[PDB]
Symmetry: none
Subunit: 297 residues, 4 copies
């Protein structure tokens, strides 16, 4: 007898194989900076903006200690961070098997460790996805090269009717972004997956499962949002220039976890002041200190 009287996050920050070698031979791409902070800050900030405090980071055995040195156990930012290893990159859906015990009986969210989002009312858009308790939620975004992604086809009335992974002839230009919200059915859906031609457990197959059951919500992420990934050397450079333009224009940072934790009330002024101290001599610590006196709307 069970008794019924929340949502957990996962960041997949595993090995990107050899695609970006030699740039990534020495370290994981999710530890590479995007302008002024490690790539992993961005997806972490996305989970935090969704209200998620308990987060599992999945990385290679080789890179886990570096993530741990960077992020700790989360206590400094009002979070709980746990770690798991992915000995070989067997696909995105494997996160749910690796993370089965972490997830337990809760709702979950998966974000890719190399995905960056930017836009207005983003916090509010993540809230509406995270509050929806049943089924699955994903976001669709108009791209130039939909063949690189999971692609969602829509009927005349705007209802999602099919998902295809990396189709040679996409039915739309709407790619599924690297952020996914799941109810308690996901671990059992993943467990029943069998590997694709590439030998991978595909997230698209998980999402198609929900779709066939009429439990997939596909929200359009509009053109006034930037969804960037750091898939090529050129795209990583563009992403850093994009963040630098916005930050240097505004004097506000994108995806500063200390800031977000503070604005969420997960840490207070006294704790924020402490986090600022060791970086007092550089731009980042000086930003954190300013946060304490300034009202930002």
């Amino acid at each position: 007898h069970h008794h019924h009287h929340k949502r957990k996050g996962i960041i997949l920050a595993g090995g990107s194989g050899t695609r970006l070698h030699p740039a990534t031979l020495a370290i994981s791409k999710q530890l590479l900076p995007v302008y002024d902070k490690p790539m992993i800050y961005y997806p972490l900030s996305t989970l935090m903006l969704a209200g998620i405090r308990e987060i599992l980071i999945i990385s290679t055995p080789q890179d886990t200690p570096r993530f741990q040195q960077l992020l700790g156990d989360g206590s400094n930012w009002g979070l709980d961070l746990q770690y798991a290893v992915q000995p070989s990159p067997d696909g995105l859906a494997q996160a749910f098997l690796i993370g089965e015990s972490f997830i337990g009986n809760d709702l979950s969210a998966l974000v890719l460790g190399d995905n960056l989002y930017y836009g207005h009312d983003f916090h509010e858009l993540l809230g509406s996805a995270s509050q929806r308790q049943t089924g699955a939620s994903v976001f669709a975004y108009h791209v130039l090269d939909p063949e690189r992604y999971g692609v969602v086809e829509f009927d005349q009335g705007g209802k999602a009717i099919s998902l295809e992974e990396k189709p040679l002839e996409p039915k739309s230009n709407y790619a599924v972004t690297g952020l996914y919200f799941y109810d308690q059915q996901v671990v059992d859906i993943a467990r029943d997956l069998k590997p694709s031609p590439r030998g991978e457990l595909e997230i698209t197959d998980v999402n198609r499962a929900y779709l066939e059951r009429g439990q997939l919500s596909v929200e359009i992420m509009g053109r006034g949002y930037a969804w960037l990934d750091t898939g090529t050397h050129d795209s990583l450079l563009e992403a850093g220039q994009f963040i630098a333009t916005l930050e240097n224009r505004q004097g506000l940072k994108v995806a500063c976890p200390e800031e977000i934790a503070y604005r969420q009330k997960w840490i207070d002024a006294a704790q924020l002041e402490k986090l600022a101290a060791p970086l007092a001599k550089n731009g980042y610590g000086q930003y954190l200190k300013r946060l304490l006196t300034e009202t930002v709307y």
Copy 2:
């Protein structure tokens, strides 16, 4: 006479944290390759094959794992540790036994050079068996560097490290050539007011005896700024623009080794095997069948 090389890829403190919290700055990519490929390339272009890499205690394994012992590229690489960021001149104390009685050269691990006939300009400094050679480059913010003053006739007459009031806009770049005197000069150095053993004091020592050759690195050369987030980005975009225009890579050690005949066609083919699926391996395999002038 033999010249040994030293790459100093030490700690940049908290200056670029949290971007460098996880990993030292010289293991970060500039566009498509680890930042250290660029100084290693500079030394290779100067004809230097025996090279010591000095890094933090934490990062030396990450450099050793990246570069190996060098035999795959016709190099002889060794590694050593700088436990504290106590000055660029410490390189010659750390590297004393490595250097032995040979000629030497020091390059900073975050220094990026681009321009015409770099191979020639290095070859001339490397051939000088006595004295020291450095390069001065016109910059906008000379205060950040070793600043060199010249008399009306163009002769180097003074060096100041990070002066409050620069005597010129000519900064000394992070590439130094030295004869057999440099270890003994470094050994007698005392810490500065900042608490560092200064490369500029080494260079002043050579200067007082008229044995410092200060060559001008002209405006037609790129000495790229890697000191800030803003400038690491600019450098990435500079390399990308060159490589995407030309279809030729800047600072590809495999290619350089191949062109200096340090490895043969069968060795370069084996190096391309692992990267075959990506742009870098494709580049290395194309090198074998194309004449580049």
Copy 3:
């Protein structure tokens, strides 16, 4: 009336480091099972099935991963976090919604009890549906604890938290029974000179209102705490001596749940299976067939 249980498994900072860097303290074993099984068993022996486990943000998920919802043992387990080690009395504020309008019991996570008819001693306190009930135990070092003073007739006349000059050698143990007032009492409390919401301050409130019952836990009971390296070791040896003599286990939740009829023979059988290869699983299997008085 139903009584709800709270186990406070609070953070012990870095007092037990590096032992507890490996895993937090109420997850460390006392001889052959996790520390938290003992206070859980105490609650279970008082007839309490609905239990809230409060711990740190980092530890609470590990307790959840160990114990789950308790359905396997006929329990109803829930979890809550205490952000900062800001006093034991915060348990009632953190736990306000869980407690609802019911009576409660609080047990500290590092407290171990052993003795004859402990079951019956818990029953007496469990059924007093008004006021609060605590237990006094004669100890050698009363200064470490909440100390209770008695007068000539053995009536409790004062409570003092870790007094420099103890008025008696009776310590109040880490087990507390409370009525419906305790949440409002905790809400009105003003933090102590130490800067922590004290449980002794909750107990003084009840005392001053003439509503605190102090029962003697006699010398034939063992009350141990496992809060230091030394004390954990001594507790391990004590449990080992009892268990190896008797061939019976102290604080086995499965056994207690089975003997309380909260799970049946079929359920206990299933719980034994995964543990079949060790002494604990063979023990649960033995309990299906053996009569133990």
Copy 4:
């Protein structure tokens, strides 16, 4: 074409102890349990360190690996280079050399079991002898009451080792081979040629017999004045805790304190040791590290 200007790499087998110590180990895994005042894994780590070994590979289950990584990091705080590898299945102690193949590379190695603790006078010197011989293998033999539980070494009348048997029901001697092994460059190749035993495992005893049969096994006696303790049962863990507690409380000195060992080895200096003492200053361990900065201990 190679050049010279020898390094020995360490491996710690911190494998999954199955269910044998459940439910104690449901919460935290075996080599993360404390022996008195520090995690079990500190003891075999300290042993490798005392042998002069700085580059160390830790092999554990996928679930345990990040817990070890959270405890120990990359080692750089203690002047070490710690690496990690996963053991998917409990397929024998010899599997360490296949899992650890690329880590070892062309170097000498040492393998230590995660649950072995050693204590005694100039253990440092004893390990030196073994660490220094750059060819063949070296093991240590120790008189025990229950040789049946271990690999057992038989000696002839002149004290030369003549056979090794794995967990024999009828032991030829009371000399068990302890869980610490030194190997030359041949071990990986010897290990690749092994086949599962009747028990279904790649057995270290088979590796050691291969060296013995080539006359390349050194068996040094670890004498009765050394303590070699096993920490793999509830009773034995508790006995090991009591033993360390008695020594530390008598001496005011710690057994198997990695920070202390790296400081005395000159792998980290006084300033770095002071940094490490900082966060732990609230307890006996940080205060102990602090005291080491001012006290001369012979």
